[PDB]
Nucleic acid binder design. Structure first.
Ligand SMILES: [Mg+2]
Ligand SMILES: [Mg+2]
Ligand SMILES: [Mg+2]
Ligand SMILES: [Mg+2]
Ligand SMILES: [Mg+2]
Ligand SMILES: [Mg+2]
Ligand SMILES: [Mg+2]
Ligand SMILES: [Mg+2]
Ligand SMILES: [Mg+2]
Ligand SMILES: [Mg+2]
Ligand SMILES: [Mg+2]
Ligand SMILES: [Mg+2]
Ligand SMILES: [Mg+2]
Ligand SMILES: [Mg+2]
Ligand SMILES: [Mg+2]
Ligand SMILES: [Mg+2]
Ligand SMILES: [Mg+2]
Ligand SMILES: [Mg+2]
Ligand SMILES: [Mg+2]
Ligand SMILES: [Mg+2]
Ligand SMILES: [Mg+2]
Ligand SMILES: [Mg+2]
Ligand SMILES: [Mg+2]
Ligand SMILES: [Mg+2]
Ligand SMILES: [Mg+2]
Ligand SMILES: [Mg+2]
Ligand SMILES: [Mg+2]
Ligand SMILES: [Mg+2]
Ligand SMILES: [Mg+2]
Ligand SMILES: [Zn+2]
Lengths: 117, 159, 202, 105
RNA sequence: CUCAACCUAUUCUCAAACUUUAAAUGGGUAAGAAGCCCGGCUCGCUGGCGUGGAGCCGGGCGUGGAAUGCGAGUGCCUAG
RNA sequence: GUGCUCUGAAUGUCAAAGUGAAGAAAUUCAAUGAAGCGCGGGUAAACGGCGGGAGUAACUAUGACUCUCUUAAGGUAGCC
RNA sequence: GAGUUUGACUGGGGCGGUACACCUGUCAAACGGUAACGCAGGUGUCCUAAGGCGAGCUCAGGGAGGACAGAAACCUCCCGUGGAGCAGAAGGGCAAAAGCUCGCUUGAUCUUGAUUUUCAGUACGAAUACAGACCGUGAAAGCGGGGCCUCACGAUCCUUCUGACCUUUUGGGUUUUAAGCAGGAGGUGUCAGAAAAGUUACCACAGGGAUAACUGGCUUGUGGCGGCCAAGCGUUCAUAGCGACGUCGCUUUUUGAUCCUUCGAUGUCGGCUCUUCCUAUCAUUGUGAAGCAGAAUUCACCAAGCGUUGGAUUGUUCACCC
RNA sequence: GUCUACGGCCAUACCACCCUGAACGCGCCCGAUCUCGUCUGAUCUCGGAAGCUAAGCAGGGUCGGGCCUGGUUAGUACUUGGAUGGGAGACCGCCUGGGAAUACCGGGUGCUGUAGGCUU
């Protein structure tokens, strides 16, 4: 690859559309992402190797592309980090740890962390 | 040997003090300067416009002209065997006032009020200042105790 | 080959280290500055003896290596192999120049490095037990024979290679103001965190 | 350098910023009846050889580039010389450079 | 676990073209009547304003506002 | 290569004069094209000039032999 | 055939370099200034944006994750005082910047003076404050007459172009032409700016010890000759004899370095001849030591009284052999 | 006793973690019809007011790190001027004046301007 080309296509999705598309991705993952996809800042993500499984029907012109999901997770009051006027940092006990990220995931999607290995 | 560039040798004098970089504080911009008053010339290096020459850094002149952002100053410069008054246009980030002339003016006003009070009250009071007289014979109490005996120490080699 | 050291004995040329501006400098002859049993802790070797200059001059790395070698050999065949630790306290950072074998374009080229020593300055130090003191003094004298100037042999009032005196040393150790680690010691001031005092003082 | 074939600057005749078309000034050909040329021919006639210096050193490698600006107004179409710094390669109205394009394979 | 890398707290020794700090000696300016303080007038500059700034016309204030020493200023011509 | 010399044919460049055109004229432009130069041959008892690197034979060494970049020729017969 | 030229600086000239016009750091001794063929480097450019505004962002680096993807491809979060970038040398400066990304533009325009820098307080170049126009940008305050600052460049004369319903073109008038006035450009890099190849052993003149080629003098790197320490050698044994790594000296019989004396002249290699001196002693006198049995030899001491040769080859000093 | 808005000096104000916050306020927060911007009303812009101090913010704390200010280092290092001082030199002592900087040991940790609020 050489610089200033075009390599990736990405998109940012938030809200009800985000939770339902995340619901579809975990339906593909059968609500199982195993050990260490959770970053230490309380975010996580995974990859999907083929998109047609869920959702949209395959189109013969469109390829067979895979993709990856990164959910960055928050808490009400996190917008002070990107507020323009009187910006601040969010505070120590308002952060998201790996433990509470896993706890929220399995409480909201009754999923399974820590498989047999 | 060396060049005749305009900032030769100004590695340290046109630099900022340690942990004093960045934004220039605004009081230096909102000072006022009337034509006739005494200003020090330093010449910070955050501002590159209107900056004085290195011969005028650390000098003192009086203002003869005020413009939008700068001031014309009359400074004495010593060329080889004469002193002559140069007229330089320097900016207000590079100048500041003179507390020497300020102190002189406040002791002028003190002298004037003192002469007025002396004239109305009918006395004669001292107005000049005198250079640190000798030391006015006095007694030194020992407070009963004997002065401590001091004595040079022996030599020991540490370092 | 190498000039006689009397051509470069005196400090007169405005310290000249190898840097960006001085390139192509050969390696100094002294590469090992510590010798003997360097892992004895603090109290295996309580006695320290220094060899300290009394002249302002520069010593060559060749002379430093020669003195280190002969002092090491005398200490080895006198106090045993693991009975001492010596550090030379002088690194040859000043580069000396040579002009080529008239005076046009005469700025020389780097041929060696010397260490500039001051009047009160330690050249070498040996730490050993308290009963090998005469052996330390003899080793430092026989190493003193390898230098141009005048040097003095002096036993320090301090414990080994530390900066604390031998009389107040064990009391500081017992009251835990001075914690041993490695060849030296750490000083514990009473103004850290109390949780640090709690993982200590216990 | 690369300067565009038109710009908008002061026109002294109308005392006003105006569009000017920009060409490159070329030195004209000699008059043969200019007074220095007349004096030079008068001096060079007869015997005596070369009577003025001939330079023959040529230290410079570039020239200052002069732009002829013409005011586009149909009534006042006055001209004006305008000079820029030295340049080896001069371009008159080339293609503008852009910052995002894939440069280069 | 032996060794590493790495990290952390220490330790030995340095810098004309490094530096937080930082002298001694040094460079400039000030130490009054061309100053001080009252009135009034002019302005096409400045302006919320009787503004601000500058200039000008009057008036009154001498304890001559550190030490020490000393008469100064000023022009032409000019050799080596 | 530098000289010297020969060929001139269609042939590039090439001064004065002459010719045509524009203009009111000074003047300008165009066509016309001598020698020379350029282009093409010759000439060294003209001036002069006349190469490197590898590996290759039953001890070893060399290199008849080969492979190589290579210039206008790569120093021949002799001689040291 | 004629006339002329054939730079300068220079640890003599030449050769080599440019220290010849400039810029950064150092030297440089805390104002400024400050030399050397001092040190470390750069310049004769580059840029319609890399100039001018406005807006919005944050950089290098690291950590943790995410299909292919691993040390490196792209996405996300956190830490990140700048450790990045700002055309280039270096120094300074700079973070809702001066960096990066967009939007709009041409203040890189037309003018008079003042000032600073080098400085003689001349010029050029570069720069700084204003003032008068016409504009750009931004909601605006403002900012902008090139490049964030310190370098990036050039007189007279001549040529060329631009401007003035301009002046003159000689007795008047018209029209070409020419001259003039103002502002750019064509260049002098020896960069305050001749137009310039050698050789002289056939040489010349004015000079120069301001300056080389001897001696002498300072120095002693180099040469030569000594000393101190003792790791080793010496079958053993540091020191009979030696002495590695180091280090202290002396000498002026080597060669350098320097340029003080001498260029209105100190005769310039070697040999021959002849005298005298030195000692750092080869022999001989008197001794001490030995790894001194004798003989031979080696190491020291007092010691320069006395002697130290004949030849081959080479101009040789040196050398080598009989 | 405090807070908002705009500040001045620009860490005694920063950084790390912990506790408390009455009332106004400042925020977090709800939404995208209009204005205006995005891949995404997350940011920016607009329209609100159900809930909340969780966070920002404020105050306090830490034998806290930094920073500020003293002591020590130390009349040490260095230095002005002087000598027919010493020393073979290298350098050193003295006379006359000036006089630092680490390591180590204390104390402190935002003052304050203009305008407008709350606190019975
Ligand atoms: Mg210099
Ligand atoms: Mg320089
Ligand atoms: Mg500028
Ligand atoms: Mg020197
Ligand atoms: Mg012809
Ligand atoms: Mg032939
Ligand atoms: Mg042959
Ligand atoms: Mg031969
Ligand atoms: Mg200076
Ligand atoms: Mg000075
Ligand atoms: Mg901005
Ligand atoms: Mg405007
Ligand atoms: Mg203007
Ligand atoms: Mg003319
Ligand atoms: Mg010149
Ligand atoms: Mg002389
Ligand atoms: Mg010698
Ligand atoms: Mg020698
Ligand atoms: Mg042996
Ligand atoms: Mg001489
Ligand atoms: Mg001399
Ligand atoms: Mg002579
Ligand atoms: Mg004579
Ligand atoms: Mg004679
Ligand atoms: Mg004679
Ligand atoms: Mg003798
Ligand atoms: Mg005799
Ligand atoms: Mg603290
Ligand atoms: Mg004193
Ligand atoms: Zn016009």
């Amino acid at each position: 690859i050489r610089r200033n080309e075009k390599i990736a296509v990405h998109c940012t999705v938030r809200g009800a559309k985000a939770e339902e598309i995340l619901e579809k991705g975990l339906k593909v993952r059968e609500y199982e992402l195993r050990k260490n996809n959770f970053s230490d800042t309380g975010n996580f993500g995974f990859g999907i190797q083929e998109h047609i499984d869920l959702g949209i029907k395959y189109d013969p012109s469109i390829g067979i592309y895979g993709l990856d999901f990164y959910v960055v997770l928050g808490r009400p009051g996190f917008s002070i980090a990107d507020k323009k006027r009187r910006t601040g940092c969010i505070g120590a006990k308002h952060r998201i740890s790996k433990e509470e990220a896993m706890r929220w995931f399995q409480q909201k999607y009754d999923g399974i962390i820590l498989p047999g290995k | 040997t060396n060049t005749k560039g305009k900032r030769r040798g100004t590695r340290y004098m046109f630099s900022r003090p340690f942990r004093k970089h960045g934004v220039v504080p605004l009081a230096t911009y909102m000072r006022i300067y009337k034509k006739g008053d005494i200003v020090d010339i330093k010449g910070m290096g955050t501002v590159q416009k209107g900056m004085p020459h290195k011969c005028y850094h650390g000098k003192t002149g009086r203002v003869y002209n005020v413009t939008q952002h700068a001031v014309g100053i009359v400074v004495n410069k010593q060329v080889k065997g004469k002193i002559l008054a140069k007229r330089i246009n320097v900016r207000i980030e590079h100048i500041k006032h003179s507390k020497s002339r300020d102190s002189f003016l406040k002791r002028v006003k003190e002298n004037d009020q003192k002469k007025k009070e002396a004239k109305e009250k009918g006395t004669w009071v001292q107005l000049k200042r005198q250079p640190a007289p000798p030391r006015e014979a006095h007694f030194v109490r020992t407070n009963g105790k004997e002065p401590e005996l001091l004595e040079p120490i022996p030599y020991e080699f540490m370092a | 080959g190498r000039r006689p050291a009397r051509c470069y004995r005196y400090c007169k040329n405005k310290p000249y280290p190898k840097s960006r501006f001085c390139r192509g400098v050969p390696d100094a002859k002294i590469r090992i500055f510590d010798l003997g049993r360097k892992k004895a802790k603090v109290d295996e070797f309580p006695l320290g003896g220094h060899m300290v200059s009394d002249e302002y001059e520069q010593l060559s790395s060749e002379a430093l290596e020669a003195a280190r070698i002969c002092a090491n050999k005398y200490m080895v065949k006198s106090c045993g192999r693991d009975g001492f630790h010596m550090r030379v306290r002088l690194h040859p950072f000043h580069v000396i120049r040579i002009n080529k074998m008239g005076m046009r374009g005469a700025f020389g080229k780097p041929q060696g490095t010397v260490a500039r020593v001051h009047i009160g300055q330690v050249i070498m130090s040996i730490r050993t037990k308290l009963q090998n003191e005469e052996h330390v003094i003899e080793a430092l004298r026989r190493a003193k024979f390898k230098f141009p100037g005048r040097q003095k042999i002096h036993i320090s009032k301090k414990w080994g290679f530390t900066k604390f005196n031998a009389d107040e040393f064990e009391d500081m150790v017992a009251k835990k103001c001075l914690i041993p680690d490695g060849c030296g010691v750490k000083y514990v001031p009473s103004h850290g965190p109390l949780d640090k005092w709690r993982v200590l003082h216990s | 350098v690369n300067v565009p074939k038109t710009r908008r600057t002061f026109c002294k005749k109308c005392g006003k910023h105006q569009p000017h078309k920009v060409t490159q000034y070329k030195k004209g050909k000699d008059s043969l009846y200019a007074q220095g040329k007349r004096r030079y021919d008068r001096k060079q006639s007869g015997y005596g050889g070369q009577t003025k210096p001939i330079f023959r050193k040529k230290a410079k490698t570039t020239k200052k580039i002069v732009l002829r600006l013409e005011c586009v107004e149909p009534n006042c179409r006055s001209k004006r010389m305008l000079a820029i710094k030295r340049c080896k390669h001069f371009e008159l109205g080339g293609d503008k450079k852009r910052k995002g394009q894939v440069i280069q394979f």
